[PDB]
């Protein structure tokens, strides 16, 4: 399977981190926490984020029903924009799509986002739908791996992934706690789409993105508590364990070695790293654990700085940035993501 198109879409409202923080600390129930909010927002290594709503509107977003309804409307808009961009990048059309997978963790849609996107773009009525909910931050990488699994079975086909994460719309569940506030420092809104074709399809029409060579999941035993949602009448409330980085530091190198061993590669054989930007401590943990050079994760840092953490969409933005730097033809790339499970997902790529 071969990537043919990758495209990111962001809401038009762009704010500097300082702007967000300045407004945020004045929101109802937050003033008493100004100092810790400013401290966390400042330490995030995030310089700006796109938000799906204007800043002033968030204090009114206290009802999960309102927020989730807005999610549905805005996510379908952004998902459609990202898919169209990726299709244009691939020189393909909506009617070419044989399977669409959507990933989100920031809203609850039934019918799923893929059914709504299919309708908006006029995908064929027989398109195969794969609504992936609950993978969280791993879904960008895992989503690309699922496209490969599909296309390995259907090598004449075209399959697409659409990731849409509107983290700001979980506002009704935000509380003045360390975990929620860390969330408000890091997460932004955005979307991304990948268009991929099977090996035979790639021999019929031109696909210019990297080859998806292989993937490997790693679900860690007894780690349900590491990250996830607390779900309730206020919506989706972030649960984040302080043990996350220790887990990375202790186990990630083995995940990578195990996977790369199977391809008789070493970490020194990979020419472009495409890692999820969980946040500064996480990225630090990844670099340390894998003993990476200082610039290995430069595009990950740059993305976190520019647009924040978009959950599953971030790694796709970073993939696009990586493709655009045009890595050495024939060299290996490695996507690395992590998420609720706890789990990691690795995807081996070959550039050109």
Ligand X SMILES: CC(C)(COP(=O)(O)OP(=O)(O)OC[C@H]1O[C@@H](n2cnc3c(N)ncnc32)[C@H](O)[C@@H]1OP(=O)(O)O)[C@@H](O)C(=O)NCCC(=O)NCCS
Ligand Y SMILES: *C(=O)CC(=O)CC(=O)CCCCCCCCCCCCCCC
Handedness of CA 302, 193, 209, 340 (dihedral sign): positive
Given a contact cutoff of 8 angstroms between Cβ atoms, the answer to whether 58 and 30 are in contact is no
Based on the residue annotation, tell me whether 167 is a catalytic residue of this protein: no
Give the Cα separation of 127 and 333 in Å (integer): 30
Locus of tokens 């890692």: 275
List the structure tokens of 320. Answer: 């696009």
Per the residue annotation, which of 137, 142, 207, 338 is the catalytic one? 137
Please say which residue, 91 or 288, places its beta carbon nearer to ligand X.
Answer: 288
170 lies in the binding site for ligand Y (CB under 6 A) = yes
Q: Which residues 209-238 are close enough to bind ligand X by CB under 6 A? A: none
Residue whose C-alpha is closest to residue 75's, from 113, 132, 112, 43: 113
Q: Do the annotations mark residue 179 as ligand-binding? A: yes
Question: From ligand X, a second copy, ligand Y, none, which one binds at residue 285 (CB under 5 to 8 Å depending on kind)?
Answer: none
- 194 contact choice in ligand Y, a second copy, ligand X, none (CB below 5 to 8 Å, kind-dependent): none
| Residue 198 binds to ligand X (criterion: CB under 6 A) | no
51 alpha carbon, distance to own chain's centre: 16
Near ligand X in 278-307, by CB under 6 A: 278-282
Gap between the Cα atoms of 156 and 342, Å rounded: 34
For 273, the 3-state DSSP assignment is: strand
Question: In the complex with ligand Y, which residue's Cβ is closer, 97 or 315?
Answer: 315
Phi/psi of residue 240, nearest 5 degrees: -140, 125
Site size toward ligand Y, by CB under 6 A: 21
Q: What is the DSSP string of 68-116?
A: HHHHHHHHHHHHHHHHHHHHHHHT--GGG-SEEEEEESS---SS-HHHH
Binding flag, residue 179, ligand X (CB under 6 A): yes
Residue closer to ligand X by CB (options 111, 328) is 111
92 binds ligand X, rule: CB under 6 A:
no
**Does the annotation place 280 within a ligand binding site?**
yes
Contacts of 47 (CB under 8 A, 6+ apart): 16, 17, 305, 306
For residues 51-90, which are near ligand X according to CB under 6 A? none
Q: How many residues bind a second copy (CB under 8 A)?
A: 60
- Rounded to the nearest 10 degrees, what angle do helices 244-261 and 280-289 cross at? 40
Q: Does 170 bind a second copy (CB under 8 A)?
A: no
Interacting partner of 111 out of ligand Y, ligand X, a second copy, none (Cβ under 5 to 8 A depending on kind):
a second copy
From the list a second copy, ligand Y, ligand X, none, partner contacted by residue 279 (C-beta under 5 to 8 A by kind)? ligand X
Return the structure tokens found at 231.
């779900």
Could you list the active site residues?
A: 137
Interface residues with a second copy (CB under 8 A) are 63-65, 68-69, 99, 105, 108-113, 115-116, 118-119, 123, 125-136, 142, 145-146, 149-154, 216-222, 224, 227-229, 231-236, 340-343
What residues line the site for ligand X (CB under 6 A)?
A: 39-40, 43-44, 137, 178-179, 182, 185, 240, 242, 244, 278-282, 338-339
């Amino acid at each position: 399977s071969v990537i043919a198109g990758v495209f990111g879409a962001l809401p038009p409202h762009r704010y500097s981190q300082s702007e967000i923080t300045d407004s945020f600390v004045e929101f109802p129930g937050l003033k008493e926490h100004e100092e810790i909010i400013r401290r966390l927002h400042a330490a995030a290594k995030v310089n700006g984020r796109h938000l799906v709503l204007p800043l002033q509107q968030y204090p009114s977003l206290t009802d999960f029903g309102d927020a989730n309804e807005i999610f549905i409307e805005k996510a379908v808009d952004l998902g459609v924009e990202a898919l169209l961009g990726a299709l244009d990048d691939a020189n393909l059309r909506p009617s070419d799509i044989d399977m669409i997978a959507t990933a989100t963790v920031t809203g609850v849609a039934v019918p799923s986002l893929d059914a709504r996107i299919a309708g908006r773009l006029g995908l064929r009525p027989d398109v195969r739908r794969m609504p992936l909910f609950g993978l969280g931050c791993v879904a960008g990488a895992a989503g690309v791996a699922r496209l490969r699994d599909y296309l390995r079975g259907a090598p004449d086909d075209v399959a697409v992934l659409v990731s849409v994460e509107l983290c700001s719309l979980t506002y009704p569940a935000v509380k003045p706690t360390v975990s929620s506030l860390v969330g408000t420092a890091l997460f932004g809104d955005g979307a991304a789409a990948v268009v991929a074709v099977g090996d035979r399809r790639a021999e019929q029409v031109r696909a210019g993105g990297p080859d998806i060579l292989d993937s490997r999941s790693s679900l860690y035993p007894d780690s349900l508590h590491i990250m996830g949602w607390d779900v309730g009448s206020h919506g989706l409330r972030l649960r984040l364990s302080p043990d996350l980085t220790n887990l990375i530091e202790r186990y990630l190198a083995n995940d990578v070695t195990t996977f790369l061993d199977a391809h008789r590669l070493t970490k020194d054989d990979i020419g472009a790293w495409v890692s999820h930007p969980g946040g500064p401590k996480v990225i630090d943990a990844v670099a340390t654990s894998l003993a990476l050079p200082p610039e290995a994760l430069e595009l990950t840092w740059r993305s976190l700085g520019e647009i924040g953490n978009l959950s599953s969409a971030s790694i796709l933005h970073i993939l696009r940035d990586t493709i655009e730097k045009r890595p050495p033809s024939g060299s290996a790339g490695l996507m690395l993501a992590m998420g609720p499970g706890f789990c990691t997902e690795l995807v081996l790529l070959r550039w050109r």
